[PDB]
């Protein structure tokens, strides 16, 4: 407990995350330009409308690949458990900035875990429906009816994921100190105590204990 910060995120997972964010900006905006044609400016997300049509799916694939790297590195820390119920029941209290008083928060809270699975499920849905509606490469192999359903679902999934990310960014901006941890990798012990009690308690113990195990 004698250090201003503690490492919350490794460089590799920070590099990935911000790669996903940049790709997502382009993919979400191009997608929105097809969804709401009145927002003409967005048809220039990838330069020209013709270019955007081509690149959207490629950058989409990149996001999926990167999110799968994130999946295998973060999933075990996002597993729902009985300790998450307390959170789910005092949501209104958590949003007022009083979560500590009402819940048991480990590495990532119950909201972050719900977001994680929402994000991971939607990118899978977007991958599958995206491939199906992809011309000229793949749409040809699918029955027209399947292509039609996929067009409906892909649009819906894309919108759901964008809403989710809006909320994910907000929260990140809201629980102050969070963005620095994702850019630099470190969180101050007090930030850990307030927003993620159980989690820091574990690092603190893992820490001290194994250093006490050495035999100072």
């Amino acid at each position: 407990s004698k250090s201003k910060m503690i490492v919350r995120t490794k460089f590799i997972d920070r590099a990935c995350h911000w790669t996903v964010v940049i790709c997502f900006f382009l993919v979400a905006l191009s997608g929105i330009s097809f969804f709401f044609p009145t927002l003409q400016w967005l048809t220039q997300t990838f330069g020209t409308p013709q270019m955007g049509r081509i690149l959207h799916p490629f950058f989409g694939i990149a996001i999926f690949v990167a999110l799968m790297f994130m999946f295998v590195r973060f999933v075990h820390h996002n597993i729902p458990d009985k300790k998450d119920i307390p959170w789910l029941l005092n949501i209104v209290e958590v949003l007022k900035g009083n979560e500590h008083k009402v819940a048991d928060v480990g590495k990532y809270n119950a909201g972050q875990k719900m977001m994680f699975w929402s994000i991971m499920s939607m990118i899978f849905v977007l991958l599958v429906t995206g491939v199906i509606i992809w011309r000229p490469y793949f749409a040809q192999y699918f029955p027209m009816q399947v292509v039609r359903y996929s067009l409906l679902i892909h649009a819906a999934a894309g919108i759901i994921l964008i809403h989710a990310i809006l909320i994910h960014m907000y929260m990140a901006f809201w629980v102050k100190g969070s963005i620095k941890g994702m850019i630099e990798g470190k969180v101050s012990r007090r930030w850990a105590k307030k927003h993620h009690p159980r989690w820091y308690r574990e690092i603190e113990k893992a820490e001290a204990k194994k250093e006490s195990e050495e035999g100072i």
Partner: protein, 289 residues
């Protein structure tokens, strides 16, 4: 664009900013294809390509007279052949296939690019290529599987109802060329009249289910057929029975959009009013007092 000022529908255009359409007092036109008089000569395929300056590849024979085997960016109309005994004796049903120029076009409804597809006051539905992004949404939106992408420029093409001829007073190339007069052209009102007269004659010859194919599900079409067996359109190489814009496409291009719009606006409001109402969540809101 809009030089003709008679554009009644335009793709990806908000309903409160309609396209220029003051010059809309024009009679609707229509092509009537009487399959009972068609001899499957393919003159229409040839005349179409000659007039339109397009040439498909030299294909292969795989056991049937049909060729090319499907519509493509270089073949805007193709004759489809069907041999059947479903009605009691051998029949060779031959049907000219290509854009139906629907009154309520699914291609235009599904298209996400402003102005890529338009509908003229006279009923012609045409592609304005400068605006096409090659997404292919129109292929799925079309109840008749008509649009085809050109690999060489990433744009879709199809029968234009010879808009370049009709616009200045002349009938389409395929219409004029038809050896037996199976294809007719004129105002839709008089083509419907000719169709009913023909149906009456077919009934008098024993075809009790002869009828006009002008599907109400798409608001009627500007390319219609007279069929010996209107009760079984599938017999004519899969012509759809009671075609309509698919329900999934209607929902996707319809209600989903404003719903998503409301969610977005409402979400932005909520988050903004939330931040302002409660304030940031920093490490210590307590030692600030």
């Amino acid at each position: 664009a809009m030089e003709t000022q008679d554009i009644i529908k335009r793709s990806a255009t908000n309903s409160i900013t309609p396209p220029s359409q003051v010059r809309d007092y024009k009679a609707e036109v229509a092509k009537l294809i009487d399959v009972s008089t068609c001899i499957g000569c393919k003159a229409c395929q040839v005349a179409c390509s000659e007039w339109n300056d397009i040439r498909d590849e030299v294909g292969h024979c795989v056991g049937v007279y049909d060729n090319p085997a499907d519509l493509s960016a270089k073949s805007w109309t193709v004759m489809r052949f069907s041999e059947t005994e479903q009605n009691g004796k051998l029949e060779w049903l031959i049907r000219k296939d290509g854009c139906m120029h629907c009154e309520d076009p699914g291609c235009l409804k599904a298209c996400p690019s402003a102005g890529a597809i338009i509908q003229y006051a006279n009923g012609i539905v045409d592609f304005q290529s400068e605006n096409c992004i090659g997404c292919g949404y129109c292929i799925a939106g079309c109840p008749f599987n008509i649009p085809r992408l050109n690999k060489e420029d990433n744009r879709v093409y199809k029968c234009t109802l010879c808009v370049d001829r009709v616009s200045v007073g002349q009938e389409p190339a395929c219409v004029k060329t038809c050896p037996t007069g199976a294809i007719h052209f004129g105002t839709k009102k008089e083509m419907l009249e000719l169709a009913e007269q023909r149906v009456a004659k077919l009934k008098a010859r024993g075809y009790e289910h002869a009828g006009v194919y002008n599907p109400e599900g798409v608001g009627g079409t500007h390319v219609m057929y007279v069929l010996h067996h209107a009760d079984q359109p599938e017999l004519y190489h899969g012509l759809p029975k009671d075609p309509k814009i698919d329900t999934s496409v209607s929902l996707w291009k319809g209600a989903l959009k404003p719903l998503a719009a409301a969610g977005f606006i409402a979400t932005f409001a909520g988050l903004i009013f939330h931040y302002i109402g409660i304030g940031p969540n920093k490490e210590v809101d307590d030692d600030e007092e």
